[model samples]
Structure formats: structure tokens, C-alpha cells
Target: RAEDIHYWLLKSEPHKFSIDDLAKQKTSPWDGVRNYAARNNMRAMSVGDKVLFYHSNTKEPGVAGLAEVVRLAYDDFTALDKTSEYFDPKATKEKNPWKMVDVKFVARWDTVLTLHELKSRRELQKMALFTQRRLSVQPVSASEYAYILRMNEEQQR
Candidate 1:
């Protein structure tokens, strides 16, 4: 069962969009990801995949919440909208280059697990987040996901 599931980490600027925003929406299209690597990761995501909602470009950057992919990959329509900031002139409805997935909020940590804390942990020393800092979406190992969840539960106690 573990091998059948996939894990991911998705980052957003707290000022622009945070875990609270996702919580309010319940489910939202994770769009506007322009990077090719991030787009490819989204393409790999399937419904029921777990996600770590990370807050970046803020005072405290870290994993703020948990989410799950509710929908499989689809064309990112935002890239075709001229009025949208994410619009790409090259992208069309017929041949969309970018893809997005719908994610539903699961839980928000009372105490966000900070990046510093993650980096300090010996078990997370090899995490992609440290090596690939610019990537907005990255794969996460099952063990890492479980460890973070345990840490959050401990923090809640």
C-alpha cells in the first residue's frame, strides 16, 4: 500500500497564498506553476496522493499543512488566459504545455515545522528541498512524510 501511494511537497508564498486560503476553499486547482520541473511533478501526481503544503518567501518558511490530490493532472487553463498573470502566449487550449492538479486541504499544523528544523534533522539531511531550493513542487519519501506527521502530532501534545 505504501509503494502504491506517492508523496509531494508544494510551496506557495504565504503573502500570496497560504494554508488558510486552501482551508477556506476546501479544494483548489494548484495552478500558475511556470517551472518545467514543477509542472512535470504535477503531471505525475494522481488522485489520493498526499502533499505537504509548504509556506515559502515569508518570515518563516516551512511545511504548514497537509493536503491530498483530489483530481488527476489537467491542462492549466490559467496559462491560456490573457488576463491572468500566469498567462503564457505559447500555451493554447489544444496544446497546453503546463498541467495542474486539484488538491483538498487536510490539516494545518498548530506549530509549523520550519525549514531550519528540517535541515537540522539528520534523517532529513538528504531531502530534496535543501538541494533543489527553487523547485515549487518536489517528491517526498514516505518515511519523510511519516516523520513530519509524527513531529506535528508531538507538537500538538
Candidate 2:
């Protein structure tokens, strides 16, 4: 009876890193974020937090699956690696501003929870996915999180 953890929705482009990609690998450090707000959101994450694996910038952007935070936020190594596309010339090991969290794949939804469906639902009207459209990482209220899982389950049937 000790389940007081936060929920999150983390976005990734299908071409770059899909939920299927995460499903194949054990876990991955959610890196390459350069935005201040998204970085702050990552830093606020805690291990064991539930995650909605969202596929953004696709023809049908939506929640592809689920994940769970496996590690707390840490400096994004990609920001310091010159060879990395996400590397920032101004970033140094000690002063690296970008942070990332590690998450492991949980399950894939039988049907993607499309944005159109979400936008049409009164219950999900206040989601940051719409309110803060550009955010790559954002918090999800417990009720919203519960409702989303329920929606996916209902859609499967």
C-alpha cells in the first residue's frame, strides 16, 4: 500500500526512437533534450514513475505504449559528446545543463491512443499534451493517467 509515485508522458519520434525500439532494448537514457522546460521535467523524475510512451511528429502522433522510470535524472552524456548530434559546444562535463532519465519498456498498447481521440475526450481536455503542445516531457495527473490506461484497455475490446 505504498504507491505514491508521479506519472509522466515522454515523447519521441517514431523514426528516431519508437516504443518498439524501447521494447527491444532493456532500457535507454532519455537524452538529446535541449529545452529548458523539458530538461527540468526530466530532472524532476523519480525512479519507478509510470510513463506513457508517446510517439510525436508522426502522421498519427499518440501514445504507443508504456514505460517506467528506472533511473533518476542525470547529466545527458550526449550533450558532452562532440560526435553526438545532440551535443552542445557550450556544454562541459561539470556544467552540462541537459538532464535525462532512464526508462524501461512496460507494455505496448494494442491500439495507439491517437491525439484525435484525446482531443475529442472531455476528460482529457486539460492534458498538457494539448495545453503545452511543444513539451517533450510533461507531468500527468494520477486521474488522467488512470483514465488513459482505461481508455486503452477499453479500445482494445
For model 2, where is the 10-residue window of minimal lDDT?
1-10
Task: Give a tens-digit lDDT track for model 2, residues 45-143.
Answer: 888999999999999899999999999898899998889889899998889888899999999887799988878877788899998866899999998
Question: Which ten-residue region of model 1 has the weakest summed lDDT?
Answer: 118-127
- Candidate 2 TM-score, true structure as reference: 0.95
Question: lDDT tens digits, residues 1-157, model 1?
Answer: 4348899999999888899999999999998999999999998898899999999988899999999999988999999999998999998779999899999999988878888888877777777899997789999998889888887787789
List lDDT for all candidates, in order. Answer: 0.90, 0.90
Q: Candidate 2, 9: how far from true, in Å?
A: 0.5
Note the clash tally of each candidate.
Answer: 0, 0
Clashing pairs in 2: none
